[PDB]
Amino acid sequence: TTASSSLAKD
Amino acid sequence: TTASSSLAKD
Amino acid sequence: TTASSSLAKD
Amino acid sequence: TRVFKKSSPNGKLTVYLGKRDFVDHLDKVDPVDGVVLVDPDYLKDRKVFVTLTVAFRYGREDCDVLGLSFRKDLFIANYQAFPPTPNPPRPPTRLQERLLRKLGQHAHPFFFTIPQNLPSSVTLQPGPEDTGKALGVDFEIRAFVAKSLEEKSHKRNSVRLVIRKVQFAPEKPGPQPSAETTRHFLMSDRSLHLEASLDKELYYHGEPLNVNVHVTNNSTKTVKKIKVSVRQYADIVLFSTAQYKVPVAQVEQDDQVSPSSTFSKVYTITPFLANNREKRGLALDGKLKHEDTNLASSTIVKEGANKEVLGILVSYRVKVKLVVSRGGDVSVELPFVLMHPKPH
Amino acid sequence: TRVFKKSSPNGKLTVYLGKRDFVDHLDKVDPVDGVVLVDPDYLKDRKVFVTLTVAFRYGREDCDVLGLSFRKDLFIANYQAFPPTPNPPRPPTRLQERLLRKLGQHAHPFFFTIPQNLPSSVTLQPGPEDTGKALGVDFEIRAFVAKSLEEKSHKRNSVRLVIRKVQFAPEKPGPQPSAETTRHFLMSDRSLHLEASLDKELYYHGEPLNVNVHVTNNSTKTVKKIKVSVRQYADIVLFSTAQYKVPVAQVEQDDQVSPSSTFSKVYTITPFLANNREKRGLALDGKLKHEDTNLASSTIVKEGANKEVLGILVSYRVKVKLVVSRGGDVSVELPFVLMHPKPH
Amino acid sequence: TRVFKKSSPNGKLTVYLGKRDFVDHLDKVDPVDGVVLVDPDYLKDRKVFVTLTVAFRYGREDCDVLGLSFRKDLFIANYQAFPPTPNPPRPPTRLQERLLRKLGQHAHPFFFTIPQNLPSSVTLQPGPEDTGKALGVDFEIRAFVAKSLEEKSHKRNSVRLVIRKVQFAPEKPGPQPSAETTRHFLMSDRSLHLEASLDKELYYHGEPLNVNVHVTNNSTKTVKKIKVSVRQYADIVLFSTAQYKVPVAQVEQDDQVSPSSTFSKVYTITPFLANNREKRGLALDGKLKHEDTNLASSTIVKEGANKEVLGILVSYRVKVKLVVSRGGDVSVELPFVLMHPKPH
């Protein structure tokens, strides 16, 4: 399914 | 609309 | 019509 | 004589055509020659073009709310009317010269040639079940003024006019159309021989056709009924060969041909539209706007067979069906043309 | 922020995509950028590829037992995700670099450029009479791992993800949309002059439209009814020009314009989907899976007219029809756009 | 043995064809070879040609009054039988030599090579609602005598004969077809694991199939019903990919799988035509004239995937659907072939 993860702010 | 005019005889 | 003939044995 | 005319809604642009109908002689078609009237102060920066587009148009153009035309463009040609181009092709014509003398300096001539490998004006009959007009190959002349060829269309600029391309009968009659059929049986040496012959190979609309049919029933089976009908075949090509055939006029007689006997007769059959107002898929000759017409004029093919399949092709055939008792039904088929004579 | 993700059923292949909605600035479109996650030993000799296919898909994909899509492919591109290729085009992007930092070595960058001559996400409304989803241009990103491009598709290998391409309103308003009509009669010098003007040329969905209509009936005929409606035109191009025009919102008033009199008024009309749930052929903006939306967003064309017709094109128009007694019916038509504002 | 024959209606032209069925070995198809009998003085100026045209024919040929075939020509070849051409390709063959010995000097050899990238004889089943025959790719050999290739067709000249191209099962069985599915819940740690396995990957028509299905319902939901069906997929390609899927045989059992339980069973399902006489869109193997047959034989693709998509492609699949209480329905799909064994 379509979902999201994390990503950090650079 | 579609109509006619004159034309001459040469 | 579709039919058949003879054919030989060589 | 007179000259037909059409003007732009703005009233600043007007186009004159020498004729509304054009005819082909099977080797050269009469060129489409016209002139356009325009005042340069209206445009002062633009250019004038005229377009002869032949389309496989469907439906109508009176803003009908339905799935509109498959707008396949069969052949398009372009010509820059203004600013003036080189003199060809080749001079201004006598009619164009006369219109220039009548009007003066604000007229511009345009010339066109119709390639011999193009269809004839045909229109399918709209069925009562559907709505609006129906499909059919048609010609159109559109004159528009703009800076570029691909510049967006404008109603005040473009002027739309409809022309027709129809054929006329050659004066040389063709060979006598006739056919024969000898039908044997599964094992018995008795057979069934029939003959069909025609008055001519060319006929005019409304003119009755007298088919000469003869039967030689030197057998024991019984002939129940004789069916006589005329079939129409409409070779339609857009990118794939297709053929919508449909009968138009059928005549029947409860005549019994006895075994070991011969029978001949002459029957009268007439192709006419009055009794087939509803049959969808019937082919009618090209209309001007919506006016009625006769059945689709048979389109004779040129001597050099090439392809010529770039539109709607129509042909007529007559079949006589013999209802023989206990199977063995056999029919005879024969071609003929049907279209107008040469006017004056 | 966040990043949308999709993973293969096997769980060894996963693709991360930076955004789900892509927008164009009328000169260049925001590039398609993402990363793909995969553990090397799963393939150990295969290669990884990603595809952006735009198709004229019909029907649905939930294994419906019916004549499925006419799957004409409009535009397709390929890129070797793994093994690594030359750095272009041109570097890994800021989002690409951020995903590489987050994940590490098993991420692979892939890049794509959407040509400016491509359609916008549009979907026709499925009619209740038929079943399942209906046709409509759509985008799709498919990442698969295999030894060859033509190697057979595998469900465990290929991963499917859907994106949309939508347009946003330019900040510069256009010219005032207005029109006029002066209708004379067959012979009489009396005429009928009417005026139509609009508030703006750009509007937002749900926002009412106030049409300014004025009539100068300095004639003798009677105006029976005034019809006001907004029409939708949907240019469909697969290999032939066609358009399925259909009204969406109509408003009527039993107002009588007397002869030798003038009449003007302001009418309020709103295009909305709530009252047209059943009309087949209505155009809706691209859906994600099956969720509802507004009406199809009007697609503005580029300044360079080129052709730009490789899909579904949608436009809006408003027509006001004047019912004049015993013939002489005349209507006025006018264009306008209708689509979302610029978000933040 | 014997040799099939067909003769022109006139009786002056007769063609002898070595075989009516042709088979391919996945690398070379048996060449089409035949001889033609003709008496020279009948033509005395013309030339003899034979044509193998493969068409996407629709409808029938018994002079039916309806929209006839979309007659797309898939692949057409030509060969000048008379006057004699160079010896290739390459000799007159053993059957050709034997026919020449039997007849003498009035026979003329012609040769043909069927490219490996061509479809197999398939015919869609005509629906009772419509009339006449239905569409389907088919082969045809037409021998005609004329001065030029483009010279008009004549019934007395042209002779029409129908051939079929069918495949036979390779002797090497493939891998065991099997599948699995583990379906968890939205949040709870309980899951649903099911197994499906098959007897073989190749089967003969009428031979029952025993699907080995096992369910591990270590979950909280209850299974209401189990649906077992076999699906047929017909990849149609004329100029755009199409796929008309339709089930052929379905079997159901009102078995309930309780939560926290395991359940396995074997089911007997048979693809047969007797119960699907009316379903339009079913695919049948190519007919000779109108005679019945089995279901469409599964067409195996060659090892080199290329495209091979120039006609009608057919494949079979079996799906088992588990009806789980209050949502969570999951199904398993699996491929297999079904077509004739190697005769002798």
Curated annotation (Swiss-Prot), chains A, B, C:
Compositional bias ranges of the Polar residues kind: 1-10
Summary of the tissues where the protein is detected: Kidney.
Source species, domain of life: Eukaryota
Subcellular location: Cell membrane
Similarity comment: Belongs to the G-protein coupled receptor 1 family. Vasopressin/oxytocin receptor subfamily.
Subunit text: Interacts with ARRDC4. Identified in a complex containing at least ARRDC4, V2R and HGS. Interacts with TMEM147.
Disease: Nephrogenic syndrome of inappropriate antidiuresis: Characterized by an inability to excrete a free water load, with inappropriately concentrated urine and resultant hyponatremia, hypoosmolarity, and natriuresis. Diabetes insipidus, nephrogenic, 1, X-linked: A disorder caused by the inability of the renal collecting ducts to absorb water in response to arginine vasopressin. Characterized by excessive water drinking (polydipsia), excessive urine excretion (polyuria), persistent hypotonic urine, and hypokalemia.
Role this protein plays: Receptor for arginine vasopressin. The activity of this receptor is mediated by G proteins which activate adenylate cyclase. Involved in renal water reabsorption.
Entry protein name: Vasopressin V2 receptor
Native species: Homo sapiens
Taxon lineage: Eukaryota, Metazoa, Chordata, Craniata, Vertebrata
Coverage span on the entire protein: 359 to 368 of 371
Curated annotation (Swiss-Prot), chains D, E, F:
Name of the gene this protein is made from: ARRB2
Chief subcellular location: cytoplasm
GO annotations of cellular component type: clathrin-coated pit; cytoplasm; endocytic vesicle; nucleus; plasma membrane
Function, as annotated: Functions in regulating agonist-mediated G-protein coupled receptor (GPCR) signaling by mediating both receptor desensitization and resensitization processes. During homologous desensitization, beta-arrestins bind to the GPRK-phosphorylated receptor and sterically preclude its coupling to the cognate G-protein; the binding appears to require additional receptor determinants exposed only in the active receptor conformation.
Protein name (database record): Beta-arrestin-2
Modified residue annotations for Hydroxyproline: P170, P175
Region (Interaction with TRAF6): 234-344
Domain-related comment: The [DE]-X(1,2)-F-X-X-[FL]-X-X-X-R motif mediates interaction the AP-2 complex subunit AP2B1.
Effect of K289A: Impairs interaction with ADRB2, MAPK1 AND MAPK3; no effect on interaction with MAPK10
Full protein segment contained here: 7 to 350 of 420
Keyword terms: Cell membrane, Coated pit, Cytoplasm, Cytoplasmic vesicle, Hydroxylation, Membrane, Nucleus, Phosphoprotein, Protein transport, Signal transduction inhibitor, Transport, Ubl conjugation
Gene Ontology molecular function terms on file: angiotensin receptor binding; inositol hexakisphosphate binding; phosphatidylinositol binding; phosphatidylinositol-3,4,5-trisphosphate binding
